Structures are given as structure tokens and as C-alpha cells.
């Protein structure tokens, strides 16, 4: 999961 | 991520970047980190892209049901507390969120709540949230006044995200800008850092660390 | 299926009464009379035993008066077995409160929970109600001395003096006649026994057909003592007021  | 929101004389400014990363890999430069919950409510996203996106659009559905049942728009306090009580149920499961619930109601006035996945919920006038929060804070704090004109407030918010986008490796892409008033939220555009940096450098004379 | 054999214990009559509650009350009306009288300096519980046999072990016996905690006792009219179920519940409930708050349970709070249990048997579960009415006698530092009653409906009310079981009509009339607010305990003891003496269905009131208890501040200074009378102590108090 990519994050911001 | 870098996101901010601050209260002032003329309502609330909300500004966010648009970068998503997986490690050092830049996954996207075009993420919409502000969610428009209703015409008087905004949510900002930082942390897990899916976690934020999913639960904040879920939050919108819960706010809609409130107004069907209660014949009245939900308070910022109550909307923020739905999200914070939700994530508190998941505490320890590994959700990753740093969010701000921003809006106006007649009973509250313009209001900002910081809500994160440890279950922290704070009312306040200024917050910056994300890996670039400190960079945004540095600019924002050192130019913030309650009396900023709507024009200046919008620029400071935009400039603070730019600052963070530049220094923080994990922030960038573009700035998204909102202004929230007694009449609801107003969108103030998407601003690519590609062009915004050079425009600001030239016009403001800042960023002298950079080869012009 | 089994619907055929269901009495439907928790329904309304066309008049809006609860059959089973009414019929339980009818059952209680043939039970040994129990009386509570509240004084300024204590409380009396007096109750008549369901007609004795000479061979009954009367001193190691208990049918009417039960200790709930150190500050609260009850007098029973109805099915003894039903009452014990409720009594142990009440005793446990008292201890939960003490454990939680480090303070003895206020009398009403105990009375309410027991009455709430009874109420439940009249609204859900399809079971028969408890065929019991209680007189609660107790002390707490909010209201001091208190008398309450509860019945199978789970309705409860507070009293200066009250009777339950048989001949409450005659008994209530007599208490109403002679009761007065400034009364001491020892006067209330006399009133209780004189009332039973006149309402009894027996030929004459003797020690062996009675249970008796007081709740006084009559220990030492600002604290309370329950006295459940031994048979010999009742025999004496029966002489002391000239009924024998």
C-alpha cells in the first residue's frame, strides 16, 4: 500500500 | 504527503499536495487528497492512500444519512467524531490516517478537527499533517496572522505546500486549494509545482538556494 | 407444534390487565400476613407463619424474614421457593454495588432492580411470574429508614406502614387508625403485634406462629443493627405488650  | 488547513478572519483555507509514494517510487502526482463530503464539509487525506480514501468516502455516506434522519446538516464535531470513533475501533490493526475535517455550520462557525488513526481528535485553528508537515509549518507559522485577506490566506496556504513540496522528497506534484466560508467551500484550482515553483521564485525572489 | 400448549403468560386481558399478575396476587392473598412499620428511630417487621404443626422445628426456621445485607431485610408473602430465588439475586446485587463503589447499596436501588426483574417476567420470556410480594425494611445515609413493597407486577411503592398477604384490607385500616408520625420503635412493635392479633385467622396469637425483626440505630452511635428475634424473645415481647 502506497502512501500520501 | 503534505496537507494543511488554517482558520482566519475570512473562514478556512485548505491546501494539499498530490503525490503518492511507495518507498522512493513516485506512484502518482495527481492524487485528489481533499474529499468534498458535502457543500459545507471537507476532509483531507494523509497516510495510507486506500485507508484515507475508503473511510473518508464512507464518512460522506454516514453524513448523508444523518441529514436524512435528522432533517439537518451534520455538525463538524459530529462528522469528525464518526471518523475518529471508527478508527478507534480499529486501533492496533494498522490503519494509517492523518486527516482534517474542515467545515462551516451555523451553530459552530468555521471549524477544523484533526483526526488520526491512533484515535486522536483535536479542535484547532492551524494544523499541518503528513511527511512534509514541518516544512509547511515553518512557512505558515512565520507568516500567519488572523487578519490575512482571503487573497493573502490563499497564497500563504499555496506557498506553504510549495515549500514542503520542494524540500520534502515525499511531497510534490501539484497544490490543490480550497476556501471555506459561511456559504460553503469554494475550489481555487489545481497548481502544478512544475510551473508554480519557477513562477514563485521569479515573482517573490525566494528560493535562492536553487540554481536560477 | 408446541404452540398448542402455551398459556401465554405475558398477555393483556381485553380490560388491559395481566392475567398472571392478577392470579399471582390472588395466590399471595392467602399467604401469612406480614407487616412493616417505620418509626423515626427504627423499623419493625412482623409476620404470621402459615399455620404451624406442633412438631415443626420453630427456632432453626425461617419462612418470612430474610437478611439481604447488614442494612436491609425483607418480609415475604407468597411462595417461599420463588422468594429465595429473588433473595439470592438481591444479596448478590448488593455485593456487586459494594464491590464497585465501596459503599453499601442505597435501599431504593436494590428494591428497583428486584422489581425490574419481576417486571421482565410479565413482559417477555413466556414464563410464569414470581408469586411473591416483599416488604423491604432498610437503612441508608440518604433517606434513613425506609419501607417498600414490591409485588409480581414489579411495581414498588414506599410506606410509613404497610401489610402484605392475607387480610391486608383489615390490617391497613387498623394501621391507618393507630399509626402516627412521631412514633418510636417500641410503639411500632406493639402496633404490629396488636394488628396481627386482630386480623389473624387463628384463635390466638402465640410466639410459635410468628417471625419478628427490628432495624434500629440501637447499637452504638450513628450505626445500624438488625435484630431477628429468637422464639423466646418473641414470647417475651408478646407478654410485654399483654397479648398472652
Amino acid at each position: 500500500a502506497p502512501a500520501x | 504527503t503534505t496537507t494543511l488547513a488554517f482558520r482566519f478572519q475570512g473562514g478556512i483555507i485548505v491546501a494539499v499536495d498530490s503525490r503518492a509514494t511507495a518507498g522512493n517510487w513516485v506512484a502518482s502526482q495527481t492524487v485528489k487528497k481533499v474529499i468534498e463530503i458535502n457543500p459545507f464539509l471537507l476532509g483531507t487525506m494523509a497516510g495510507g492512500a486506500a485507508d484515507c480514501q475508503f473511510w473518508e468516502t464512507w464518512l460522506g455516506s454516514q453524513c448523508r444519512l444523518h441529514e436524512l434522519r435528522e432533517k439537518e446538516r451534520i455538525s463538524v464535531a459530529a462528522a469528525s467524531k464518526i471518523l475518529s470513533n471508527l478508527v478507534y475501533q480499529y486501533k492496533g490493526a494498522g490503519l494509517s490516517m492523518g486527516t482534517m475535517i474542515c467545515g462551516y455550520t451555523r451553530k459552530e462557525g468555521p471549524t477544523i478537527y484533526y483526526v488520526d488513526s491512533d484515535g486522536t481528535r483535536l479542535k484547532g485553528d492551524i494544523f499541518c499533517v503528513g511527511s512534509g508537515q514541518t516544512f509547511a509549518y515553518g512557512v505558515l507559522d512565520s507568516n500567519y496572522k488572523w487578519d490575512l485577506s482571503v487573497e493573502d490566506a490563499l497564497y500563504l496556504g499555496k506557498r506553504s505546500i510549495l515549500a514542503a513540496a520542494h524540500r520534502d522528497a515525499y511531497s510534490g506534484g501539484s497544490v490543490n486549494l480550497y476556501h471555506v466560508t459561511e456559504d460553503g467551500w469554494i475550489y481555487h484550482g489545481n497548481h502544478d509545482v512544475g510551473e508554480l515553483f519557477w513562477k514563485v521564485k521569479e515573482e517573490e525572489g525566494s528560493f535562492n538556494n536553487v540554481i536560477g | 407444534g408446541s404452540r398448542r400448549y402455551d398459556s401465554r403468560t405475558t398477555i393483556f386481558s381485553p380490560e388491559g390487565r395481566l392475567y398472571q399478575v392478577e392470579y399471582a396476587l390472588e395466590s399471595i392473598s392467602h399467604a401469612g400476613t406480614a407487616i412493616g412499620i417505620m418509626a423515626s428511630d427504627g423499623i419493625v417487621l412482623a409476620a404470621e407463619r402459615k399455620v404451624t404443626s406442633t412438631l415443626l422445628e420453630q427456632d432453626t426456621s425461617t419462612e418470612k424474614l430474610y437478611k439481604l445485607n447488614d442494612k436491609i431485610a425483607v418480609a415475604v408473602a407468597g411462595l417461599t421457593a420463588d422468594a429465595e430465588i429473588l433473595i439470592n439475586t438481591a444479596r448478590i446485587h448488593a455485593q456487586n454495588y459494594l464491590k464497585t463503589y465501596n459503599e453499601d447499596i442505597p435501599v431504593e436501588i436494590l428494591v428497583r432492580r428486584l422489581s425490574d426483574i419481576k417486571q421482565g417476567y410479565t413482559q417477555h420470556g413466556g414464563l410464569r411470574p414470581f408469586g411473591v410480594s416483599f416488604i423491604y425494611a432498610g437503612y441508608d445515609d440518604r433517606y434513613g429508614y425506609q419501607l417498600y413493597t414490591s409485588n409480581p407486577s414489579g411495581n414498588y411503592t414506599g410506606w410509613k406502614a404497610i401489610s402484605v398477604g392475607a387480610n391486608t384490607s383489615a390490617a391497613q385500616t387498623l394501621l391507618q387508625m393507630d399509626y402516627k408520625d412521631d412514633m418510636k420503635v417500641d410503639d411500632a412493635i406493639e402496633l404490629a403485634l396488636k394488628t396481627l392479633s386482630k386480623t389473624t385467622d387463628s384463635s390466638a396469637l402465640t410466639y410459635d406462629r410468628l417471625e419478628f425483626a427490628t432495624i434500629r440505630k440501637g447499637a452504638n452511635d450513628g450505626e445500624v443493627y438488625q435484630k431477628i428475634f429468637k422464639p423466646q424473645e418473641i414470647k417475651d415481647i408478646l407478654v410485654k405488650t399483654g397479648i398472652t
Binding site: - | 468516502t57 455516506s61 448523508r64 444519512l65 436524512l68 434522519r69 | 404452540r3
Partner: protein, 235 residues
């Protein structure tokens, strides 16, 4: 006695048939579907003049594009409305779109026969469900406690229904304007109502694609009432 889920010798569910009797005792509700919108009107029927009539809520929003009117044991409708609203909002969450009116109605109707020895009896209330969606346009549905629902161009339910339905049979045509339909609901209501129709004991509402579901204020309805008498007097 006898099971709640029992069939009669005619092959009908006793409990469902008996709930239909309870609905006949209900206050009147009427809906008319046009190409410009769907109107929903009801008889408030205050049981005493002291009761504040605006607190009588027999027309109800489900979503922006769906509205509801009821007749019968109206307390039974709370959970049906609650289910409807959840079903509508949930659908939008799962699919990022508006839920179809028929799908909504079918979802509510699925609740109906979930009773037995699940709930203890059928609902004692019928529903008129009116909305718009892009596929099938403006729609009106009559949802019964049998689990059956019918689409209608116009429909009346409640005590005055058989009289009002015969009237709707004559008056409805495929080209009614919204304004014609509003008047018509008002007219037919005044006919079958016990007491004299005014803006306090009847209520109107519509759903249009453009502005969604709106309940009319008493000021607006009072004027359509006035406009209706002047139309009838004038011929």
C-alpha cells in the same frame, strides 16, 4: 390459535390479508406520475385540533431522487424507511451512482415476508414510492405488505382509495403537466376526505430530476388549493 405463516383454504396468507384490512383504515395517500415529475399527496388526519399538524410526517425523503408516502399503521413504516435510506446510500457507496427506483422498491419489498415464528407479523402499512432515474424516468410504485409492488401511472391508497382510484382512472392521461397533476391530487383528496381540505390537513410533494424530492410548504400548497377552487367555479 394458529400459525402466523398459515395459508387460508383459498391459498392466501391470513396475516397478510388481515394487514390489508388495517391499511384500508389508514388515511388517504395519492400519487400521480407525469413526464415532468411525480406528485405525492396525503391526508394528514389530525385526531384532535390541539395536535400540531406539521408534526404529522406521512411524506418522507429516501434519497434526493426518491420520495415516499404511507398509509395504515404508520409507526410500522419507520424501519422500512430506515432500510430504504440505508439501501440507497449504500448503493451509492458501492457503485458511485444513484440507485434505481425499482431496485429500491424491490429492496424494501424483500423485508415484507420476513415474518414468522425475523419479525412477528407483517407490516400494517402500504407505501407509495416515487422517484426518478436515468434509465426508466419518473416512476410510481405501490409497495404492499405481501411483498408485491406494482408500478402505477397514478394510485390511491387508504380509506378513500376505491373512490379516488376510479376518479384517477378518468382523469389521468399520458400528457399531464406537473401543475395539472398537483391540482388533481388536491381535487381528489378534497373529494374523499371527511373534513374540509386545507393546507394544514393535507400535504403535497414532488420529485423532479432537476431539484429532486421536495415537500411543499403550507404557503405553496394553500395557493394551489386556492387555484383549484377558482378552476372549478369557472365552469
Amino acid at each position: 390459535d394458529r400459525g402466523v405463516s398459515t395459508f387460508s383454504p383459498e391459498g392466501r396468507l391470513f396475516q397478510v390479508e388481515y394487514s390489508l384490512e388495517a391499511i384500508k383504515l389508514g388515511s388517504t395517500a395519492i400519487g400521480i406520475a407525469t413526464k415532468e415529475g411525480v406528485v405525492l399527496g396525503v391526508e394528514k388526519r389530525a385526531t384532535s385540533p390541539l395536535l400540531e399538524s406539521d408534526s404529522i410526517e406521512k411524506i418522507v425523503e429516501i434519497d434526493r431522487h426518491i420520495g415516499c408516502a404511507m398509509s395504515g399503521l404508520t409507526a410500522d413504516a419507520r424501519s422500512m424507511i430506515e432500510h430504504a435510506r440505508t439501501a440507497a446510500v449504500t448503493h451509492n457507496l458501492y457503485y458511485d451512482e444513484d440507485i434505481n427506483v425499482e431496485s429500491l422498491t424491490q429492496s424494501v419489498c424483500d423485508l415484507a415476508l420476513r415474518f414468522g415464528e425475523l419479525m412477528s407479523r407483517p407490516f400494517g402499512v402500504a407505501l407509495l414510492i416515487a422517484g426518478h432515474d436515468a434509465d426508466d424516468g419518473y416512476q410510481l410504485f405501490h409497495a404492499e405488505p405481501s411483498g408485491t409492488f406494482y408500478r402505477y401511472n397514478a394510485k390511491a391508497i387508504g380509506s378513500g382509495s376505491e373512490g379516488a382510484q376510479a376518479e384517477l382512472l378518468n382523469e389521468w392521461h399520458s400528457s399531464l403537466t406537473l401543475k395539472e397533476a398537483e391540482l388533481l391530487v388536491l381535487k381528489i383528496l378534497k373529494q374523499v376526505m371527511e373534513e374540509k381540505l386545507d393546507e394544514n390537513n393535507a400535504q403535497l410533494s414532488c420529485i423532479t430530476k432537476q431539484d429532486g424530492f421536495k415537500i411543499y410548504d403550507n404557503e405553496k400548497t394553500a395557493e394551489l388549493i386556492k387555484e383549484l377552487k377558482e378552476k372549478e367555479a369557472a365552469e
